[PDB]
Design an enzyme around this catalytic site. Structure first.
Site, short mmCIF file in Angstrom:
data_model
loop_
_atom_site.label_atom_id
_atom_site.label_comp_id
_atom_site.label_asym_id
_atom_site.label_seq_id
_atom_site.Cartn_x
_atom_site.Cartn_y
_atom_site.Cartn_z
CD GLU A 165 19.64 4.31 3.43
OE1 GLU A 165 18.82 3.79 2.68
OE2 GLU A 165 19.99 3.74 4.56
CG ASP A 217 13.06 -1.00 2.70
OD1 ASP A 217 12.44 -2.01 2.48
OD2 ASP A 217 13.35 -0.66 3.88
CG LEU A 267 10.49 2.39 7.56
CD1 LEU A 267 10.21 1.45 6.45
CD2 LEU A 267 11.15 1.58 8.65
CG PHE A 289 20.07 6.45 8.65
CD1 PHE A 289 19.58 5.80 7.52
CD2 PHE A 289 19.77 7.81 8.79
CE1 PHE A 289 18.81 6.51 6.59
CE2 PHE A 289 19.04 8.54 7.86
CZ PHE A 289 18.53 7.88 6.75
CB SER A 300 30.66 -5.96 16.54
OG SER A 300 30.58 -7.06 15.62
CG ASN A 316 31.70 -10.32 15.94
OD1 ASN A 316 30.71 -9.57 16.13
ND2 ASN A 316 31.73 -11.58 16.38
#
Ligand code: CL
Ligand code: XE
Ligand code: XE
Ligand code: XE
Length: 162
Positions: free
Chosen positions: A11, A20, A32, A104, A117, A132
């Site tokens: 990040e 972002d 965010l 996250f 998945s 996948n």
């Protein structure tokens, strides 16, 4: 390596409000602020989050504070979600960090949307899960990151972060 170091690499850290990869207002270690196109709305939510008039700038400790709350919250959301918790509990430590990174970045609902998945992961079919997982908008939009997290679930090691 641990979840905090891992997400810190994924990040980055910016002390001033920034947009972002999706163009939304964010600050710190991927915190965010709002999906609103309005910078004032962003500044407002920032001040509310830190508890002071920040003027769109925060300190390193404030960024770290938001990050600690954000990680805690991600973990708590997995544990609370009936579709995620059983998978998470079945995984080893390294792979649980990969699950946290995903939540996250994309949220509990987002991750809980990867039904196929999640089952492959629960079954310990790694290569299959990895294949996948890559069939997603997430991988096409942020391939480098998606590749690191995928390899983490594939291998159960931190090699991609080394
Ligand atoms: Cl990326
Ligand atoms: Xe998960
Ligand atoms: Xe997950
Ligand atoms: Xe997943």
């Amino acid at each position: 390596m641990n979840i905090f170091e891992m997400l810190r690499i994924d990040e980055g850290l910016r002390l001033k409000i920034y947009k972002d990869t999706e163009g939304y207002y964010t600050i710190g270690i991927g915190h965010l602020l709002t999906k609103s196109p309005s910078l004032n709305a962003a500044k407002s939510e920032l001040d509310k989050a830190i508890g002071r008039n920040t003027n769109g700038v925060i300190t390193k400790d404030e960024a770290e504070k938001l990050f600690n709350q954000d990680v805690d919250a991600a973990v708590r959301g997995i544990l609370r979600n009936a579709k995620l918790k059983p998978v998470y509990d079945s995984l080893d430590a390294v792979r649980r960090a990969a699950a946290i990174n995903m939540v996250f970045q994309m949220g509990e609902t987002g991750v809980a949307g990867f039904t196929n998945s999640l089952r492959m992961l629960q079954q310990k079919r790694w290569d299959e899960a990895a294949v996948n997982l890559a069939k997603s908008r997430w991988y096409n939009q942020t391939p480098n990151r998606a590749k690191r997290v995928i390899t983490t679930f594939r291998t159960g090691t931190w090699d991609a972060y080394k």
